[PDB]
Amino acid sequence: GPVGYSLPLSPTGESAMLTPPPWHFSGEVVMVDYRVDPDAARRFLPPGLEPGADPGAAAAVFATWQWCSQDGAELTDPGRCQFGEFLILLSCEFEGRPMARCPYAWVDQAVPMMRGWVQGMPKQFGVIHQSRPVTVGKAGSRLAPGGRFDGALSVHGRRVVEASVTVDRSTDQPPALHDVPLAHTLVFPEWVPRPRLVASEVSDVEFSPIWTGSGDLTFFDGLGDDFGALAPLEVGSGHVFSYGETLHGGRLLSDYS
Amino acid sequence: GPVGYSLPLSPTGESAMLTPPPWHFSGEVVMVDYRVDPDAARRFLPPGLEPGADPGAAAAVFATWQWCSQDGAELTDPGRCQFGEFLILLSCEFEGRPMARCPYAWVDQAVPMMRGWVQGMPKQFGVIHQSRPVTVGKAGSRLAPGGRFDGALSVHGRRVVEASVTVDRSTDQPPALHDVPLAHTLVFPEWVPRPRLVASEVSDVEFSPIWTGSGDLTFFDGLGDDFGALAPLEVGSGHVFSYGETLHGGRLLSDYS
Amino acid sequence: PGSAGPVGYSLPLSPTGESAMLTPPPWHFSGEVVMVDYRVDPDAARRFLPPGLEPGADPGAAAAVFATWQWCSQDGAELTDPGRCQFGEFLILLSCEFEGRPMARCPYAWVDQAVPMMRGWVQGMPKQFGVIHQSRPVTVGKAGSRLAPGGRFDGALSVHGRRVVEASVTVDRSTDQPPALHDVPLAHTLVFPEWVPPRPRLVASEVSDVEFSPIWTGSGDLTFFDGLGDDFGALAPLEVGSGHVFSYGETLHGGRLLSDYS
Amino acid sequence: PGSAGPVGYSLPLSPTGESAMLTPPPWHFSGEVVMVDYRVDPDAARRFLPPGLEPGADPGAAAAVFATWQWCSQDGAELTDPGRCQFGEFLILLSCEFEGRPMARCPYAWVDQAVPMMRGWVQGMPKQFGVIHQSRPVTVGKAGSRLAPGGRFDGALSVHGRRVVEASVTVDRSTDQPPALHDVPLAHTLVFPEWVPPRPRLVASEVSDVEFSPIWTGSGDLTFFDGLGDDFGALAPLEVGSGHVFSYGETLHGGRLLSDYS
Numbered sequence A, B: 001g002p003v004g005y006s007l008p009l010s011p012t013g014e015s016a017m018l019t020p021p022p023w024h025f026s027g028e029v030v031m032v033d034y035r036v037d038p039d040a041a042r043r044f045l046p047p048g049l050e051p052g053a054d055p056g057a058a059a060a061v062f063a064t065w066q067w068c069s070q071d072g073a074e075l076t077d078p079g080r081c082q083f084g085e086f087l088i089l090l091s092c093e094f095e096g097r098p099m100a101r102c103p104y105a106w107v108d109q110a111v112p113m114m115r116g117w118v119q120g121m122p123k124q125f126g127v128i129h130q131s132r133p134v135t136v137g138k139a140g141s142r143l144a145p146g147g148r149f150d151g152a153l154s155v156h157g158r159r160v161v162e163a164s165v166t167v168d169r170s171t172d173q174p175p176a177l178h179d180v181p182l183a184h185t186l187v188f189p190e191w192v193p194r195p196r197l198v199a200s201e202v203s204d205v206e207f208s209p210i211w212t213g214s215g216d217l218t219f220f221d222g223l224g225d226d227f228g229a230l231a232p233l234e235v236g237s238g239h240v241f242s243y244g245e246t247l248h249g250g251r252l253l254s255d256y257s
Numbered sequence C, D: 001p002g003s004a005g006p007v008g009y010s011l012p013l014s015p016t017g018e019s020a021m022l023t024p025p026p027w028h029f030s031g032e033v034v035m036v037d038y039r040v041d042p043d044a045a046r047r048f049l050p051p052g053l054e055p056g057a058d059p060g061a062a063a064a065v066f067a068t069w070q071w072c073s074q075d076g077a078e079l080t081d082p083g084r085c086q087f088g089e090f091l092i093l094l095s096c097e098f099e100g101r102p103m104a105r106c107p108y109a110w111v112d113q114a115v116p117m118m119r120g121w122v123q124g125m126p127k128q129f130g131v132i133h134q135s136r137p138v139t140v141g142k143a144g145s146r147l148a149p150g151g152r153f154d155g156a157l158s159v160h161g162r163r164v165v166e167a168s169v170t171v172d173r174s175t176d177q178p179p180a181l182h183d184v185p186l187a188h189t190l191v192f193p194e195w196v197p198p199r200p201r202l203v204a205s206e207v208s209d210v211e212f213s214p215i216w217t218g219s220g221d222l223t224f225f226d227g228l229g230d231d232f233g234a235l236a237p238l239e240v241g242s243g244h245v246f247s248y249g250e251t252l253h254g255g256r257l258l259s260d261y262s
């Protein structure tokens, strides 16, 4: 019968929407660290994920990505291999080890959206915009002191997050929540009448120099009270950097059995 | 911990991208019946699904839908509750009973796309356009003899299906492939190192009068040789009609155990 | 007859004229409308009326109009490509008069397709780009409303990712009385920026073959939100009146000069 | 000083002028370009040149240009809204001359945002709407190419859901020599359809502060596909030459009249 890594199945397996991992990612990031209500954050952590050594540490992350499979085939079609993303990260721990939980994410392309659910990453669809550094002319900011970079997310036609960073210095210190494993919940609805906690296994994690400065972050109404509970109490430092990793598959943290 | 019918999980369950069934659908359809190579069609049928009593009977279906949950809440936001769809149907049988297999489908909204995979319906993302009947003025066709209606699908910026119907008469005879159960394969990729054949359980199936006439259908390159194998050998009658159903959940046809 | 360079009704010019983005008029329109009548600050509305246009007989009468359209040129060629011949629109209409005759001024319009947007500027309709959603009546199933008493229909406009207008109509009854602001000539201002170091003209859109379906009428609701600036906000509803759901057709031929201010 | 009705640099007019879709120039541009030089049928190209523009010193020189831009007005206000200040573009350029001076003619352009599209017509650039994709260089990870020898960069244009141009560049070396067609004035035709029963003008875009990054150059590949008509197809490549990847900036001030054909 027909085969494939994913739907649609086909006689050769070529029609599948998704390709098997590993997948490579190369992205540009605009990120703001912030303080979240720790009691709100705790309510987004499933069993096994405990509050972070700093329970109120969170981050808002805008990124633009290119991705490809092991053969690099997608790279020659920029429309296929590019997407934009916004996500929230919360600090947590699993068996005493620091991790990050992503309670919310949005992307602007279908393949990444579905692939997110494969990994347990709770992606929905949104419109996501992000400033890009310039090196010539006057219509933008250089990656240099005083450079400003903005991000915005709209969902169903309503503007729900805006962030800004004005950088003042370069460092070699990766932002903490972007340098720990992500712990996701793998679950799909049961169509015919069992969640698993998993971590994304990565290799070849790489950061550019990190441009850091002031951060600004505002949440707006339009995603509901549960999301609103994660709005910043205080906003910290911003960071602008490039990031790469290879995603291989999942490792089980717990199946609650 | 956080809950929900689907991701993202949240403390109240309100953040979930998908709502539990049942879901109601009301749609406008432009459909063309056609002859497919039966040996090509057979290769898209998984174990348990056997060739149709007429193995070469296929259909190309364009539809525009409104949908909602049991509470009707989505109806007040037309941007949330509308989508367009194109799908291929193939005639098959399960345990001697006529059914339809959908080997390929595309939609233009994220919620329906994900919900399709919940049901085993192999939806990907596309750009889908469809003529609408008019009742005033000159810029369109009436639902009346001589009225013409067109459909088009583009995927990743390449035009891959065009269809047309010019209607000549109204009937009370629902198109055969739109009036049998759909048999889907429920399978998700395994992220941490088992397909099921299921049928969609529906109620309250309703057709408007069926406007029927000549059909035209062309496939173009741009989805690969596996899809191309289902191109029409001959094109039959076209149909333009409205359709409603309520989708409740899945029933297991086989888990291959 | 004695033409040299490339030609065309509009840019881009080409040797045959076939490449032009726009076709010459007339253009035919067939649409579905969800409209809400409302009361505007008359003094605010007046400031949007150029010289030559006087306040309407009822200076506070305004309307918010959602429509989805199919259009084509005389030859009908666009109809076979639904992606090319369809667009959604949201308009504000204000009541006014030219030399004693009732007309409507459209101070703001949005559409979701490029050809209509540019063609709007040709006619003086001040179209910008937006995301526009509108309920459609259904006739089978449960996922929507029928054109019948109790039927509800909604419209929403977002611009640059910010929700700026929402309207709703719940219809009670059918009538043969077209809504006043949808049944009078539109008076636009033709002006285009001058690139080489503008002379506006007041024009009316000349139409024929205007046609309405029966009008379904009932309660209206309308809300403006922030995100288009204070000039737009000045036209927000003081009070909201009746809503209407109907189909509309017309043929647009060209402009008739009301004043060139000579 | 003595102004009555509503005002604005462009439609829509408003009491303060704040609602206008377009801002007055100058406008600043900062972009990333993927460009392929190619050989065009010179006789085909000539038919796209209006009176006053002569064939280029090399009449068969043409280029296909993909660019992604950020832009802003003098005050920089648009930069804080990336959705408002970014757009993608695809252009064809043809070599020509005005009174002995090298210039470039743009017979066709597409963009993916409404403000740039309309602003194009203000300047005479014949912009239509399309879907435009372009590779970006990466500096970390494996999912892309570096600006370095061996780096590959692709561009694609689709119009009305049909793929019409694809280009690729694989760079070998860096130079300080800007590609010829990207380093000469653009000569456009200003014309807008007449609504009330056109006078074209040949203009050059006046720019300052033109700036290039180092130019990465290598092999070029370019393919045109059906779906924009035979007039466009006449400009398809006979031969394809070098490709170039670079960053570009300029400030656009207004038009300079080359001929009003008086």
Ligand SMILES: *[C@H](/C=C/c1c[nH]cn1)C(=O)O
Residues within 6 Å of the ligand: A025, A067, A085, A111, A112, A113, A115, A116, A121
């Ligand atoms: C979704 C997200 C991938 C990712 C990796 N880091 C951050 N986001 C996908 O495309 O699989």
Ligand SMILES: *[C@H](/C=C/c1c[nH]cn1)C(=O)O
Residues within 6 Å of the ligand: B025, B067, B085, B111, B112, B113, B115, B116, B121
């Ligand atoms: C996807 C498809 C639903 C459907 C029902 N009939 C045809 N397509 C979804 O929205 O769940």
Ligand SMILES: *[C@H](/C=C/c1c[nH]cn1)C(=O)O
Residues within 6 Å of the ligand: C029, C071, C089, C115, C116, C117, C119, C120, C125
């Ligand atoms: C723009 C708008 C046309 C129109 C006619 N009635 C309402 N709107 C266009 O497409 O020309």
Ligand SMILES: *[C@H](/C=C/c1c[nH]cn1)C(=O)O
Residues within 6 Å of the ligand: D029, D071, D089, D115, D116, D117, D119, D120, D125
């Ligand atoms: C349209 C195009 C501007 C431009 C400048 N160089 C290349 N394209 C606009 O946004 O005005």
